[model samples]
Every structure is written in C-alpha cells, then in structure tokens.
Target: CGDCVEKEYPNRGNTCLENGSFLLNFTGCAVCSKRDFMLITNKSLKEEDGEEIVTYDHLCKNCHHVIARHEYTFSIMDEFQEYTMLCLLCGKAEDTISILPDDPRQ
Candidate 1:
C-alpha cells in the first residue's frame, strides 16, 4: 500500500487532504440512518494500571450483538504488530494483532 493523506468530498460536510485520505465523523443521518462514522486506522494504544476506563470497537450495535454470543478468549501477549478500530459510543478498541515472523522463538 501507499502512504495516503486526507481528501475532500461533496456529499455533505466532507473534506480531503493532500495525500488522498479523508476522515469523517458523521453522527447520524437519514441515508446513513443512526449510524456513526466508521473508523479505520493503525491506532497506538496504552493503558494505565488499575484505571477504570478501557475502550474498543469493530462494528455497530446490530453487528456486535450478532457476534457477542461466540466463544472467545481475549488476552495480550508480550509481542506482535497491532491495529484497531475504536467505537465512539463505548470507547472500545478492536485490535488486530499478528505474529512477527522475525520473533526469536519462531
């Protein structure tokens, strides 16, 4: 992939930047209808010990409820590359972590 920046649009309150990238935070609309902006990024994350706040995101209310019933184990290992999409509503971050090929053990 190439390094792209923000850009502009004409539909509504849209704006683009120099490298062909754009960001929108539309709360809700008739066409988009009660849907918040879909965020995609390589966000760096950190947390403080014993803090009361933690956040994440992947999809919306309906989509999340559909997948919530699955069996899963969530944990953090000492290594890997990561990306995340966060929800503005609940402040949750859905992480995409992967194994490093150059890891000493592997």
Candidate 2:
C-alpha cells in the first residue's frame, strides 16, 4: 500500500490545505477543505468462543470513492487473530502484518 502510493506520486509536503484540514489529494488541485471521506458502515459479530470480528468501510462522500473494506478479528485468547488492510482502488495489500496468536512480534 505505502509502496504503491509512493511509487505513483512524489512525497509532496503536507498534502493538506493551508489551514491544515483536508488530506485527500487530486489532480490539478492540491487540496480541498471539504470532508471528502466518511466511514459509512461498520459491522461486528461475536464468535462462538467469545471472539469478536469487526469490519468497516470508508468512502469518499464527495466523489463516491470507495476506499476498502477492512476486517479485524480478536481471538478469545486475548490476542489478535487476524488483521489486514487493502486498497480499494489499487486492490493491494498495504498491511501484510499478519500476527498469529503465538507470533514472535507479539
């Protein structure tokens, strides 16, 4: 995810507006002060073993740009069962950080 965005565009400083508001970037225009993106919906389900799985979607309220559907699951054993982030536009896995229950990084 980070690689693709960086590869596509240069690291322009503070893609936000002068007043420090917007972060969404566009062609020709540098920034817009409107709230372009919004979290539309979120849902969660409880597993039989007491684990919780949550999912949500973020979308551009202005251009109707659907970002991605992110899902996260918490294990009943008090650890992250799964976590991932994918770009809706590019369809790429930005976060390959899959941490199992016994993961070393834990």
Candidate 3:
C-alpha cells in the first residue's frame, strides 16, 4: 500500500469575480506548482433525463493529478430556474444551447 503513490490535485486559478462566467484556456497545479493540464474525460453523471450533470476532469501532465473536476449541470435559460454551477477554480455558465443546431429526424 505504501508503494502506491497518492497525489492531491488542487485547482489553483481564479476564474471570475462573481456574476461573469467563462472558461479558462490554461491552468496550473497547486500541489506541484506547474502549468500542465489536460482533459481527462467528458461524461454525464446519469442517464435518462434532459437534466443531467456533465462532469469534467483536468489532469496535470507534470504531476499526473486531478487539477480540476467540474460537474456542469444541464442547460437552462428560463432565468427563473436559475441553475448555476461554479468550480471556484475552473467553471462557467452553461446556457448557450448550441449543441443541437441541426438534428436529423427519422
């Protein structure tokens, strides 16, 4: 068990001030203090639902650790539902609704 090296991937970056939402182009690791990140995976939390949580992982190429983990919720633009999600390090608003621009109906 001791041989298995454990690493704590800490996200070290300021995304925004408050209301403004956006994504970062790059990031560094808090644990190693290095700028080397990569997209680990992009998948949803569950199935069978219009409202689902899409999770994203940022891995450090240098430290090989999880720098950031984002659980982006489903898209909502009602302004009343007010579904907002933040990562404190690397997260942004999700209400563009530009995924399904042209769908072929069968």
Candidate 4:
C-alpha cells in the first residue's frame, strides 16, 4: 500500500496546533452564524514559575484567517472595547486589535 494512498504520517504523542474542525462545539460568528476558522496555537514558557502556557487564536469564518490573538489570556496592557467586524474581502485587516485610551472616562 502506498503511503500517499493510505494517508499515513508519523504519529506523535501530541500537538499544539489543533484543526479548527475539532473545536466547532465551542463558538461561532454572531453575524453569519458560522463555525469555521484556522486554529493557531502558541505556547509560552514561564521561567519565574516553571510553568507552561497555551493560547488560542480567533479567526474569521469567511476567510478562515486570524482575527484575534491571546484569546484566552489577559495582559496588563489589555483594555476593553466594543466588538468590531473585519472583512478582508472588503479591504479590512485580517487581524486587528483595539487600543485602549489612557483615561477610562475619555
């Protein structure tokens, strides 16, 4: 049997990058009601605490492209903002993040 025909690959213990199809049970777009996107994964090592961290990527359905990062983690520089749409077909960025104002009242 040919390897190509069998579609065989070396089996590894585990992987960080998970196919988007496996995570469809989680969430979807509010506008189009679609659950499709590329799953990008990142792992960070903590030297201070000797631990590992993982992060998932948020992507647009239509394009199956990254729309957000650090979806599961918060940073001190992080801020709150209203949700916005980014349509690459309509000349929008594939991934975009909002910047918070210095003054919360402003």
Candidate 5:
C-alpha cells in the first residue's frame, strides 16, 4: 500500500492576467478577445515516474469554438517554465502562434 498525492492540473482554478504571470486559468477561454484559450496540463500521471506533463485544449471564447485539439508535454524542471502560447484556429504547425493584443480585428 502507498499514499497518493493530490496533484494540481493546469485549469482547475485560476484566472488569466495581463502579464500571464498568474496561476493556472483553465476555465476555457479567459482572454478578452474570446479567441484565446488554454490547455489543462497534468491529465496523466504516474507514480512510477517523478515527472510532470501538461496538456492543452484549443478553445475559442468569442464563438466558443474548438477547431482542433492537441497536447504538448514537457518535463518538470527546477524553475517554472512558460508554455508556448498559441492560437488554436491555425491548422498547421506553423499556424500555432501566439495571439497578440494588437491582432487584426477581422
């Protein structure tokens, strides 16, 4: 028998901020544009393993649309590392890019 630790997922309970230096915000798309969304990392875990992996859910706030779904996992490091923020609407790998504030109003 062993003990199980309560793990913290990405979007369990947090809000999106200006600097993006806040706790996890996993309540769908929290950005003002509604096009910005986030992924919930740590869905899968292993006791045999002592590493952390995170996943993302492509979401849209404006239309509440999820074009495509994908997840990227990385090893947990000593210091907090930033995730590659991107836009979900883009289909190709190159399409995966950060959504900026001064984006086209199209």
Candidate 6:
C-alpha cells in the first residue's frame, strides 16, 4: 500500500527495474533464499483516457533486505474487463484489450 520510493542497497544494476516478484516469479534470494515479499497493490488512473493502471508491488517481508517490485494493469469495466501482467512488470507496457460492442440495446 506504500509507494515504491528509491532506497539504498545498490547491490544490483537496474535496482528498481529488478526483482519484481509478482509476475517475475522470483522465488529465491541471497539473504534468505525464501525471498518472501508481501503483496502490495495500488491504482493509477490515466485521467485523459478514463482508464486505470493498477500497480502491484511485492515488498520483501524480510527486514534485512526489504526488496520490492511492481507491475500494472487496466481492469475492464462492465465494469471489470480482463487484463494481463506483462510489460507493466518487466520493461515496456503492452495492451491486452477487451471487447464486445456489436450487441443488443443498452
């Protein structure tokens, strides 16, 4: 529920760009190998497009090395369309669209 702010622990390159346990499936760590992180979620909205990108940050449950990671998604409305955990997690972002327009009345 907290924001993913920059900290110390400059042990690896692309620090913020690494260790995103959610979609990355990070199962181990050097500190304890358990690499157990807590699942944290946040919501971001593109006000211009009326869309939302949900952010999921996995923060280390360990105090010694409280590592963290993040990802995003747009839940469809109907409200609640399906979305995926891709670019938003690793690198760039891609869209997995949802639809169903040509139907009856509204």
Model 6: what TM-score?
0.39
Runs in model 6 lying further than 4 Å from the true structure: 1-24, 41-47, 64-66, 75-95, 102-106
RMSD of each: 14.3, 9.7, 9.8, 15.4, 16.8, 9.7
- Cα error, residue 61 of model 1, in Å, equals 29
Candidate 6 lDDT over residue span 15-103, tens digit each: 22323443343444445555444444443434225445544444446543434444444445563343434322244333343456653
Task: Give per-residue lDDT, candidate 5, residue 10.
Answer: 29
Query: At residue 39, what lDDT does model 6 achieve?
Result: 47
Residue by residue across 1-106, what tens digits does model 5's lDDT show?
Answer: 0001012222312222111211123223323333234333223333224343333434343544442333433232343322332212211111122334555322
Global lDDT for candidate 4? 0.32
Candidate 3 ranges with C-alpha deviation above 4 Å? 1-27, 75-83, 92-106
Higher-TM-score candidate of 2 and 3: 3
In terms of lDDT, the poorest run of 10 residues in model 2 is 14-23
Candidate 1, poorest ten consecutive residues by summed lDDT = 1-10
For residues 1-106, write the lDDT of model 4, one tens digit per residue: 1111111122222212312223322254444445544344453423223222333444555655454443112222245322221211111112223555664533
Q: Against the unseen true structure, what C-alpha lDDT does each candidate score? A: 0.27, 0.35, 0.42, 0.32, 0.28, 0.39
Candidate 6 colliding pairs, count: 3
Candidate 3 accuracy as TM-score: 0.45
Q: Candidates 3 and 4: which is better by TM-score? A: 3
In order of appearance, the predictions have TM-scores of 0.20, 0.38, 0.45, 0.28, 0.27, 0.39
Give the candidate order by descending TM-score: 3, 6, 2, 4, 5, 1
Candidate that would win on TM-score: 3
Candidate 3 structure quality by residue, lDDT tens digits, 12-82: 34222222212243445556765534446544465333454555555666676665555555433332222
Pairs with steric clashes in candidate 4? none
